Amino acid sequence: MNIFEMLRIDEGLRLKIYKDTEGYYTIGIGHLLTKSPSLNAAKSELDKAIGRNCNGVITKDEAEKLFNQDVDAAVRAILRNAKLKPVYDSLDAVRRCALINMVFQMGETGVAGFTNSLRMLQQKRWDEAAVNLAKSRWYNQTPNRAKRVITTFRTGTWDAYKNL
Known about the structure:
Layout: H1 3-11, E1 14-19, E2 25-28, E3 31-34, H2 39-50, H3 60-80, H4 84-90, H5 93-112, H6 115-122, H7 126-133, H8 137-141, H9 143-155
Antiparallel strand pairs: 1-2, 2-3
Helix pairs in contact: 3-4, 3-5, 4-6, 5-9, 6-7, 7-9
């Protein structure tokens, strides 16, 4: 298993503009288009992102290209962030995937806000961190996905996904 397969399981693949769990316009593999309520604003962002008139629909290839960009950008954000980098550097390969997943879902800023959990992960207090991570809006809003990520941090294995 790798970051791509992990995220593909968590986000799914949709080739037509759709609304995410938060009600925002998204396409492909969890590629947020706009927080704006206008489908028109979304279609515009889409065309800007792909470089063609898509009329709200894209191909598999296009979805995969956006996905490669998003994953790369998530990693780069962690490496540039003063709060995130040190944690990332301290983690093993599997756990590194769990942090990248959070950043992809919630943005750098959002993750950097989990101060206490970050400190516990850095200290390698797995059980404590899993308990702290669960006390968040994130966990309450998307519990099945949060549990998968949390189990990943907790165990350092891909068990939560070997099911799926």
